[PDB]
């Protein structure tokens, strides 16, 4: 499996043509699973889910989608509440690929999109696996914006290598994972004109009139499916206290917390994460 | 596997001869695992771990031990802090069976004993799997005694079928699990003279000068092994808020919470519990 | 000040004539304050706020209102979401007494009514003082129904002195406060035909289609006024973990927790409670 | 009252002569109260408690002490667990001034010293008022070091105005409070050779063999006096989740949380803080 062998594109309608790039693996496997990556500026499906796609592809038909504004998907200069926007694009994709009710795996921003999709199109979403998810989290104890959020904001206003490194360093428990190569790689992608446009778009969406759609903790009591919340104990972006409302109010919720693990669960605990996900999704 | 085929007895020294009854299964499997049951008056290894021993025995050499004062182990009329006492007996057993460093699975009271053992004899305890454990839990939000604890206390003072049923009913989420047969069975065992003696002994131990040994939340930051905490979201004996100090302070801790599950995790979520335990213990 | 000297009645419109009994004290004091009592079956303004009305009346114009279904207010056999219903009655009273924007002090059920009123008629509610309030609380850790709620339910199905005593005993930290006289007094009021009707009405309202109105934790982020949450650490009806969503989401929120204090804050910590309330309400 | 009019010095014995600078006010008032300031590098009694000393001095005999390593107290290049060290110095002062059992008000680092003193010399400590205290706090949800702690660490390694400003900005909710004048003032004091020595001393103490003395959350269940914990909801140094073990385990504990308030409670909510403290200390 390679970036190129799995690469796919699709055009869907979200207030007009919207191009989506995604990776497909495990064709032939009966149960399709959709992965939605995290929200760092230089993040994408392939890099986010490197330690995972090949593994999950052994059991499922994997569709790893680049969310609008990331990777090789369209990067519009404007949009509404981001999760609702990305949800609309996923719906377009689902319809185009003839998918019915499919399970979703999403981390951080991508978890927020998974949930918004599950609420907006309740019939199309199966079991959910959510790693340090945004949107349904509400930080009962941590002052907002968190360190992780603030660091992303700083890079958004001052796109320097120094600021990106500082940001990345609060993504993980083992800061040794933030190597010069990783920093340089993410920075090349995060600082392109298009990524900056995406960032400026994200910023302006924050102050829209549809902010309620992002406050998903008020709604998840409506979800009828099994939901596996997965958290790194040392998550500094969406901290562990953010798990509580969702654990309490989602009827068929479960929670797994890994000690010695940060915001990037799929990386720092890739083996443990892969195994939980396979078992959960009935594979 | 039957109660009889697996039954074993051992005499160990805890301030003198102390008889221990236990169940052995999976002989021939390389990795030994010790299970320590919960603390209801009519509880024992065989009934506590019915949905589990045969399964785990497929992967491990299972020793399910009746804790002093329960099942067919000696039921003394007096002893110190219970967990420290039961720990001493386990040490005697370990030494007698030539066991070295072995993983421990313990629920409720039995989890408290697993931990006390891991702290008192740090070299002899491997990975720990703890389901709604006592001792290392401190209920940060729930007033003590909890409903579950209070109900056990009531039966201890008034040993009637009515009181035992009320107690059992707060052990599970699905109260339908508390059938007349289950109630009658537990009551026959819980109301024998010896079980009453055990209960009276437990009560008097509470007010000993060694109470600190029971406050294990002050010590678990010393544990060096991986520890899997498992909780039922609706646990009414040792509630979920009791997990927090241990999750935070145990370096290699993990936590799994099951929604729609009470204090009896191994029963209400036996399949999910069995699978977590097997994977965790490297089997 | 006596029950009789302060007694007042008013007829308001809530889907037709609805009689409200209330107590008025401190006439002449410039700032009016409305108190809303707790929800025990034999509860009322006078008994709920005995250690408080005379004190607060020294600083404010006190209107202690019996909520519909309690004390000497109408006790209808049917109504919708209770808090929304009681809110409508308070609005009727406000309008009739020419009140404008007034602060509200409410405990337990009465706190839930204060909040529902503040959300439904945002202009008419000033600062809020809420003691172990229902409605805006969501018990993130305690399994529901709590012991306190369950005990009230038991009395509702089996209205015996024994059951009421058991209920009352989980209202306080110092169980010595539950004297035979208190038990007999509350029982005489709680077991009248009208109180039973009120109870049966409350029960049926629980399963109405307007249940969302009771889930006030989803809405309190809309409140613009200062709100003082007051909790007994050992509250066994609406436990301390229920405070968290409201503390986090109410912009001008404050929280005070008293150790060694149960659900009846105004009783067990009457002096401390009185003083916090006076200072808070700017008196 | 001025810095100069209230200035006092004392020589006490802590492994030899140790000079302590402090401020005395309200002489003639019967009840003495000791204040222990926070731990920012340029922090001291006078600046920490500016909005408070004159006020409290109206009701009490105020002794605001500069903790060793701060203000005008000795700044040694080496010492053990800081709180235990500062406690020893306070004991020396108490003895020298003929003080008996006196209440203590301490914020942040100074709260940790108040507690260590109360545990080490149980007879000499009366009621405690603790604002965002260190030592007895254990951050159950926030990854450590917190943003606040990390920012102080950065300044300790790179003592620039930029780094101090960033640090100060996470001390308050209203960042407008961090004016250029405040930044310049604190920086002049924080960057002196002696303050750097103090900082280097603090750093080396962290890795001493007496680290347990700093883990005061394991001990506060021994405190017999009333203790008022006060927290800013948006505290980014010692966050609100740090309050929980102490609230639960201190028998006569109380907690007050102010929304829209950071780590500097005595500044951002000086009026509310002053009033709580006066009432609590029985004045």
Curated annotation (Swiss-Prot), chains A, B, C, D:
<dbReference type="GO" id="GO:0016823">
    <property type="term" value="F:hydrolase activity, acting on acid carbon-carbon bonds, in ketonic substances"/>
</dbReference>
<feature type="site" description="Transition state stabilizer">
    <location>
        <position position="108"/>
    </location>
</feature>
<dbReference type="InterPro" id="IPR029058">
    <property type="entry name" value="AB_hydrolase_fold"/>
</dbReference>
<feature type="binding site">
    <location>
        <position position="48"/>
    </location>
    <ligand>
        <name>substrate</name>
    </ligand>
</feature>
<keyword id="KW-0378">Hydrolase</keyword>
<feature type="active site" description="Proton acceptor">
    <location>
        <position position="263"/>
    </location>
</feature>
<protein>
    <recommendedName>
        <fullName>4,5:9,10-diseco-3-hydroxy-5,9,17-trioxoandrosta-1(10),2-diene-4-oate hydrolase</fullName>
        <ecNumber>3.7.1.17</ecNumber>
        <ecNumber>3.7.1.8</ecNumber>
    </recommendedName>
</protein>
<keyword id="KW-0442">Lipid degradation</keyword>
<dbReference type="GO" id="GO:0009274">
    <property type="term" value="C:peptidoglycan-based cell wall"/>
</dbReference>
<comment type="similarity">
    <text>Belongs to the AB hydrolase superfamily. HsaD family.</text>
</comment>
<dbReference type="GO" id="GO:0005886">
    <property type="term" value="C:plasma membrane"/>
</dbReference>
<feature type="binding site">
    <location>
        <position position="109"/>
    </location>
    <ligand>
        <name>substrate</name>
    </ligand>
</feature>
<feature type="binding site">
    <location>
        <position position="107"/>
    </location>
    <ligand>
        <name>substrate</name>
    </ligand>
</feature>
<comment type="pathway">
    <text>Lipid metabolism; steroid biosynthesis.</text>
</comment>
<comment type="function">
    <text>Catalyzes the hydrolysis of a carbon-carbon bond in 4,5: 9,10-diseco-3-hydroxy-5,9,17-trioxoandrosta-1(10),2-diene-4-oate (4,9-DSHA) to yield 9,17-dioxo-1,2,3,4,10,19-hexanorandrostan-5-oate (DOHNAA) and 2-hydroxy-hexa-2,4-dienoate (HHD). Is also able to catalyze the hydrolysis of 2-hydroxy-6-oxo-6-phenylhexa-2,4-dienoic acid (HOPDA) and the synthetic analog 8-(2-chlorophenyl)-2-hydroxy-5-methyl-6-oxoocta-2,4-dienoic acid (HOPODA).</text>
</comment>
<dbReference type="InterPro" id="IPR054676">
    <property type="entry name" value="HsaD"/>
</dbReference>
<feature type="binding site">
    <location>
        <position position="264"/>
    </location>
    <ligand>
        <name>substrate</name>
    </ligand>
</feature>
<dbReference type="GO" id="GO:0018774">
    <property type="term" value="F:2,6-dioxo-6-phenylhexa-3-enoate hydrolase activity"/>
</dbReference>
<dbReference type="GO" id="GO:0051701">
    <property type="term" value="P:biological process involved in interaction with host"/>
</dbReference>
<keyword id="KW-0443">Lipid metabolism</keyword>
<dbReference type="GO" id="GO:0102296">
    <property type="term" value="F:4,5-9,10-diseco-3-hydroxy-5,9,17-trioxoandrosta-1(10),2-diene-4-oate hydrolase activity"/>
</dbReference>
<dbReference type="Pfam" id="PF00561">
    <property type="entry name" value="Abhydrolase_1"/>
</dbReference>
<dbReference type="InterPro" id="IPR000073">
    <property type="entry name" value="AB_hydrolase_1"/>
</dbReference>
<dbReference type="GO" id="GO:0006694">
    <property type="term" value="P:steroid biosynthetic process"/>
</dbReference>
<feature type="binding site">
    <location>
        <begin position="39"/>
        <end position="40"/>
    </location>
    <ligand>
        <name>substrate</name>
    </ligand>
</feature>
<keyword id="KW-0058">Aromatic hydrocarbons catabolism</keyword>
<dbReference type="GO" id="GO:0016042">
    <property type="term" value="P:lipid catabolic process"/>
</dbReference>
<comment type="subunit">
    <text>Homodimer.</text>
</comment>
<feature type="binding site">
    <location>
        <position position="186"/>
    </location>
    <ligand>
        <name>substrate</name>
    </ligand>
</feature>
């Amino acid at each position: 499996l390679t970036f190129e062998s799995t690469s796919r594109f699709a055009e869907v309608d979200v207030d007009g043509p919207l191009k989506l790039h995604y990776h497909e693996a495990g064709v032939g496997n009966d149960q399709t699973v959709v992965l939605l990556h995290g929200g760092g500026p230089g993040a994408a499906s392939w890099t986010n889910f490197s330690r995972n796609i090949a593994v999950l592809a052994r059991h499922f038909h994997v569709l790893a989608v680049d969310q609008p504004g990331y990777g090789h998907s369209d990067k519009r200069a404007e949009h509404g509440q981001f999760n609702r926007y990305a949800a609309m694009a996923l719906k377009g994709l689902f319809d185009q690929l003839g998918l019915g009710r499919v399970p979703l795996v999403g981390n951080a921003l991508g978890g927020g999109t998974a949930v918004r999709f599950a609420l907006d199109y309740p019939a199309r979403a199966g079991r959910l696996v959510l790693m340090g998810p945004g949107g349904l989290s509400i930080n009962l104890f941590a002052p907002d914006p968190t360190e992780g959020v603030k660091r992303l904001s700083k890079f958004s206003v001052a796109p320097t290598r120094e600021n990106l490194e500082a940001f990345l360093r609060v993504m993980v428990y083992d800061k040794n994972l933030i190597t010069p190569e990783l920093v340089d790689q993410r920075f090349a992608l995060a600082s392109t004109p298009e990524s900056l446009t995406a960032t400026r778009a994200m910023g302006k969406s924050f102050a829209g009139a549809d902010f309620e759609a992002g406050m998903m903790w008020r709604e998840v009591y409506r979800l009828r499916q099994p939901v596996l919340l997965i958290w790194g104990r040392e998550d500094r972006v969406n901290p562990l206290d953010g798990a509580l409302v969702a654990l309490k109010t989602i009827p068929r919720a479960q929670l797994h917390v890994f000690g010695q693990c940060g915001h990037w669960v799929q990386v720092e605990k890739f083996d443990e994460f892969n195994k939980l996900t396979i078992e959960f999704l009935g594979g």
